[PDB]
Amino acid sequence: GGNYNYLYRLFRKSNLKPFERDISTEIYQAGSTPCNGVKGFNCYFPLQSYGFQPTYGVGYQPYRVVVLSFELLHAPATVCGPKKSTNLVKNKCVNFNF
Amino acid sequence: STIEEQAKTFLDKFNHEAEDLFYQSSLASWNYNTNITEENVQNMNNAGDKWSAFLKEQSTLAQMYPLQEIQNLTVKLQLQALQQNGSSVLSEDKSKRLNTILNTMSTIYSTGKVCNPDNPQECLLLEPGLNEIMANSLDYNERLWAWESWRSEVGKQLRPLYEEYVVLKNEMARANHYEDYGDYWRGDYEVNGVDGYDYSRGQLIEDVEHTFEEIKPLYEHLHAYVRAKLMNAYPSYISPIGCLPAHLLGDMWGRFWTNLYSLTVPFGQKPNIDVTDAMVDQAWDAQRIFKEAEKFFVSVGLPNMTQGFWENSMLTDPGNVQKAVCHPTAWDLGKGDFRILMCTKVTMDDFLTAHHEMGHIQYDMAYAAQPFLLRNGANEGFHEAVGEIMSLSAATPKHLKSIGLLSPDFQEDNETEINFLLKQALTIVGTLPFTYMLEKWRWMVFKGEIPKDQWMKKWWEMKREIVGVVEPVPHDETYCDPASLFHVSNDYSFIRYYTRTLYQFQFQEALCQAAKHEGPLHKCDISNSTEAGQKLFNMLRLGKSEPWTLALENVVGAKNMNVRPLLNYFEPLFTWLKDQNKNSFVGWSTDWSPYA
């Protein structure tokens, strides 16, 4: 029936800064006449809800996007991953990295 | 303050809601068509007028915008498209009666009932039956009786309604700053943008006459041949000095001459190309037809149809109570939804219909990058031309041979080519004069040049002068023959079916020019020619984004709609007719009548 729970900002005076989230719901004023929180001659709602449906074609379907942004502040590292290790072979002169 | 920059926000706001609203309304209509049942009626209607309930304010809001200084061509075009008020310019008391009269003519024209005087309890309609009475019959009395009954019981009551419809429509046009409603039909075939491509509404009237005088000798020769065949079939009924009647053309109005093909076969020994039995022997189902239609489109360079068309769209066999309409249509619901509604069978006619529907669907997705208001053709004659191009190029015997449907050892000769050419001509070239005559008569009666009393006599005189058809029965002013036609009372433009044909051969010729082929125009195929894939796409990827004058420049050499390839497509037919109708005088005399 159209999933209207996902919203996107359509009108804003200026663009977003990097890694900035804005949840303002002020009635956008495209023209010069101020509006007291209502739509009208040149005032429109910044947020619009999607109408996603399963019959929508490729490119119009809902798409889950996750962005992993790594930060490397001078503090000691905490997010480190794979610790792949070899097998334990003994009784042979070998070099090791315990 | 500025108006140009604040119109973009309004355009985006309108388009965002229009996209999903039109998608939902089209989905409701598609559900109703796919499922003929009550449950899918009201909801569909609940969408339909609702879209109208949304189309008025966006039209109403398009009056505060002074569209006379915006320098953005696309934005100005969108604002002009949104600025047309439609029928909201006249008074409500006249608007309601206009709607009522339109509804009543639509209902009356579709409920024509004529009963035979000897058997007054058997009335028929425009549904097959009365249509079948003369569609396939060899008679002169029953055909004339059906013609007279239809034009007396359906052609009488529509005349008073059309009388006030003409004046009300002209007054609406004047309210829309149109001196006549022919200009309203010619508004789309006009651009006021880039210099050097300018066109005017009055240019069409003179240009159509300019492009109609070069096919008169061929039409006269074909008319003489048809008249001679009628003499060979109907002795002492068609005058060699005169011409053929109206009901003997093959259709009640002479729109198509296909019914007379059997009576005008040049060489009956050579049969027409038929591979339907071969298709049955090869076990070709609807899926095989639909996948074979795809190879032709993909061998030129066009993309493949996306997933969901095979799943969401109905394909074949509605079967039980789950009733669906069998009328082949292509529906672009928006937001990436394209569907087909047709009933497939094992027939070359069905193969051509599938190719036509695929051409329409490809043209529709071609301009998908355009916004909601610009996903339309430049004129009404581009969709049909694109659809008919692929039907034209799939009718070649070479194509059937290469797809494993015709014998590779085939021995096709000039005789069968001429037979197929005449069969095609009886459908294509035999309808241009009638469409011309109907459009010209409608334009000149909307202009008001003639008085009210000079309506039928002038129509019949121009029919004898142009088409070369005499009156089967005398006609007085109380009758109305044009009103007894589908696209005369439903407010449908009839020039749409003319210019498209003028494009088709042109396009085909240009496509043939981009086909690496030598010989006749009919035999050349666009298959196995990738170079023509992008060139045609130049007109496919534009739509309403660019004017038709500019659109007709990336495929054809000249942007003018000059009908060059019509005289060369039927070149073997023309040179055979030159060697056939030597003993029969060509033309017609407008003094002889069947009744006197």
Swiss-Prot record, chain A:
<feature type="region of interest" description="Disordered">
    <location>
        <begin position="74"/>
        <end position="96"/>
    </location>
</feature>
<feature type="disulfide bond">
    <location>
        <begin position="35"/>
        <end position="43"/>
    </location>
</feature>
<feature type="region of interest" description="Immunodominant HLA epitope recognized by the CD8+; called NF9 peptide">
    <location>
        <begin position="3"/>
        <end position="11"/>
    </location>
</feature>
<feature type="region of interest" description="Disordered">
    <location>
        <begin position="10"/>
        <end position="45"/>
    </location>
</feature>
<comment type="subunit">
    <text>Binds to host ACE2. RBD also interacts with the N-linked glycan on 'Asn-90' of ACE2. Cleavage of S generates a polybasic C-terminal sequence on S1 that binds to host Neuropilin-1 (NRP1) and Neuropilin-2 (NRP2) receptors. Interacts with host integrin alpha-5/beta-1 (ITGA5:ITGB1) and with ACE2 in complex with integrin alpha-5/beta-1 (ITGA5:ITGB1). May interact via cytoplasmic c-terminus with M protein. May interact (via N-terminus) with host bilirubin and biliverdin, thereby preventing antibody binding to the SARS-CoV-2 spike NTD via an allosteric mechanism.</text>
</comment>
<comment type="function">
    <text>Attaches the virion to the cell membrane by interacting with host receptor, initiating the infection. The major receptor is host ACE2. When S2/S2' has been cleaved, binding to the receptor triggers direct fusion at the cell membrane. When S2/S2' has not been cleaved, binding to the receptor results in internalization of the virus by endocytosis using host TFRC and GRM2 and leading to fusion of the virion membrane with the host endosomal membrane. Alternatively, may use NRP1/NRP2 and integrin as entry receptors.</text>
</comment>
<feature type="region of interest" description="Receptor-binding motif; binding to human ACE2">
    <location>
        <begin position="1"/>
        <end position="63"/>
    </location>
</feature>
<protein>
    <recommendedName>
        <fullName>Spike protein S1</fullName>
    </recommendedName>
</protein>
UniProtKB/Swiss-Prot annotation, chain B:
<dbReference type="GO" id="GO:0070373">
    <property type="term" value="P:negative regulation of ERK1 and ERK2 cascade"/>
</dbReference>
<feature type="binding site">
    <location>
        <position position="255"/>
    </location>
    <ligand>
        <name>substrate</name>
    </ligand>
</feature>
<feature type="binding site">
    <location>
        <position position="151"/>
    </location>
    <ligand>
        <name>chloride</name>
    </ligand>
</feature>
<keyword id="KW-0378">Hydrolase</keyword>
<keyword id="KW-1133">Transmembrane helix</keyword>
<keyword id="KW-0862">Zinc</keyword>
<dbReference type="GO" id="GO:0015827">
    <property type="term" value="P:tryptophan transport"/>
</dbReference>
<feature type="binding site">
    <location>
        <position position="463"/>
    </location>
    <ligand>
        <name>chloride</name>
    </ligand>
</feature>
<feature type="active site" description="Proton acceptor">
    <location>
        <position position="357"/>
    </location>
</feature>
<feature type="glycosylation site" description="N-linked (GlcNAc...) asparagine">
    <location>
        <position position="85"/>
    </location>
</feature>
<keyword id="KW-0963">Cytoplasm</keyword>
<feature type="binding site">
    <location>
        <position position="384"/>
    </location>
    <ligand>
        <name>Zn(2+)</name>
    </ligand>
</feature>
<dbReference type="GO" id="GO:0098670">
    <property type="term" value="P:entry receptor-mediated virion attachment to host cell"/>
</dbReference>
<dbReference type="GO" id="GO:0061025">
    <property type="term" value="P:membrane fusion"/>
</dbReference>
<dbReference type="GO" id="GO:0005929">
    <property type="term" value="C:cilium"/>
</dbReference>
<feature type="disulfide bond">
    <location>
        <begin position="115"/>
        <end position="123"/>
    </location>
</feature>
<dbReference type="GO" id="GO:0002003">
    <property type="term" value="P:angiotensin maturation"/>
</dbReference>
<keyword id="KW-0597">Phosphoprotein</keyword>
<keyword id="KW-0964">Secreted</keyword>
<comment type="subunit">
    <text>(Microbial infection) Interacts with SARS coronavirus/SARS-CoV spike protein.</text>
</comment>
<dbReference type="GO" id="GO:0008237">
    <property type="term" value="F:metallopeptidase activity"/>
</dbReference>
<dbReference type="GO" id="GO:2000379">
    <property type="term" value="P:positive regulation of reactive oxygen species metabolic process"/>
</dbReference>
